[PDB]
Amino acid sequence: QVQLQESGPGLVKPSQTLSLTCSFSGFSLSTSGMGVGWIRQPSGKGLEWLAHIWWDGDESYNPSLKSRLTISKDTSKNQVSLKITSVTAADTAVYFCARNRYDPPWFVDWGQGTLVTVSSASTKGPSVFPLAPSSKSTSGGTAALGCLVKDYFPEPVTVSWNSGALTSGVHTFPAVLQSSGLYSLSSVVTVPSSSLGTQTYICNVNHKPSNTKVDKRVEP
């Protein structure tokens, strides 16, 4: 029933202020005992608690982020915000918001998170190339095809197949940082060779930071 969603700028320059918002439904932050917390996770690392705010406005902060955090709430808008001053590459992480009722907090519901990259580098849209299925993949068996999403910054890029109608056998690989400082990824799908053929395969690419959208038809 309860839903939480984090939102942020995605890319922030070093020394600037990062602003994050947690938008929720299914509960009220005016309900006695209610609280909302912020937790972060740097790539390949664990969970770190950052801040918390109660229904009565009482704020709690992790001293490891000393004098850099400001947690606030707007109960009439079902929103909780987090402000992080003087950001550095050490603040690059996925930011999550979570809710609890009563003390101590049992974080009962969490949002999916928002990725924040702290970098001076400019936003760049990707080029999308088809990975055409081979002439001899497996005649009357399984064929593999995909899309190469190359030279973009920052993360993330959204990849779907046939506007979300094709999910089975899909593998969207985690992006790799190239020597140029730009990301590259491949998204593949294994399908029956007999449908190559008669069924249309389109990869839908959306790089939200640059608003670069590419839908590529992948044919043999």
């Binding site: 917390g37 937790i39 664990g46 969970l47 770190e48 608690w49 918390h52 709690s60 902060y61 992790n62 001293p63 490891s64 999550f96 979570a98 003390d103 101590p104 907090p105 049992w106 974080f107 009962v108 519901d109 969490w110 949002g111 999916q112 998170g113 080029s127 190339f129 088809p130 990975l131 055409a132 081979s134 993949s137 399984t142 593999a144 995909g146 190469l148 190359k150 593998h171 969207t172 690989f173 985690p174 992006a175 790799v176 190239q178 590259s184 990824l185 491949s186 593949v188 294994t190």
Partner: protein
């Protein structure tokens, strides 16, 4: 400041196994401990709160025990959907602190990868760059060796690898390897091969193509 520790960083366990995940607090936390499950690409979920209380909607195979400093999360009979990173959290004193996390992998039967080679598209070549892609599809265990051969010459330093998280449907992994070289260097050679070494293969499998 309460320090939380999880002695197991990561482990693999078979479906049906009894799994034990420990958490240790630097001082008495008076049962104010909760367990969280982080599945790849999904929101974190609360499993157990106040040491042993089961969160609504969580199956009974998940149980919590402990007192003072030592706590344990038990999965009585592991299911294939249980692969995730498990975190403990203390609520005894501010600042609230988490354990480092325990990554649990599903141990399944060995499966050889299905190997596919993709030449650089005609569209990409029109930009002076050529990317050759090798796909290793649905294999177990995670460990796999990819060797790029250009006109029988072994390549080094010009390739990058990416591995997916464990598959929710069959407990396998998939791997993508990209060989990067200029269009000028791409047109100089004819044979482009991807050699795969994996536990599921009796001998290494090679997938190749002729540019023309």
């Amino acid at each position: 400041d309460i320090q939380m520790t999880q002695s197991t960083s990561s482990l693999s366990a078979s479906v049906g196994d009894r799994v034990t995940i420990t958490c240790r607090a630097s001082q008495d936390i008076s049962n104010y401990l909760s367990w969280y499950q982080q599945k790849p690409g999904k929101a974190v979920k609360l499993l157990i709160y106040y040491t042993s209380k089961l969160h609504s909607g969580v199956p009974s195979r998940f149980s919590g025990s402990g007192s003072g400093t030592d706590y344990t999360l038990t999965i009585s009979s592991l299911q294939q959907e249980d692969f995730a990173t498990y975190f403990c959290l203390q609520g005894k004193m501010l600042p609230w602190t988490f354990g480092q996390g325990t990554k649990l992998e599903i141990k399944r039967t060995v499966a050889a990868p299905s190997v596919f080679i993709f030449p650089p598209s005609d569209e990409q070549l029109k930009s002076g760059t050529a990317s050759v892609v090798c796909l290793l599809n649905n294999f177990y265990p995670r460990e796999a060796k990819v060797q790029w051969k250009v006109d029988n010459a072994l390549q080094s330093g010009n390739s990058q690898e990416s591995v997916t998280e464990q598959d929710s449907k069959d407990s396998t992994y998939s791997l993508s390897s990209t060989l990067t070289l200029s269009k000028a260097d791409y047109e100089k050679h004819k044979v482009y091969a991807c050699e795969v070494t994996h536990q599921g293969l009796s001998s290494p499998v090679t997938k190749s193509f002729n540019r023309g």
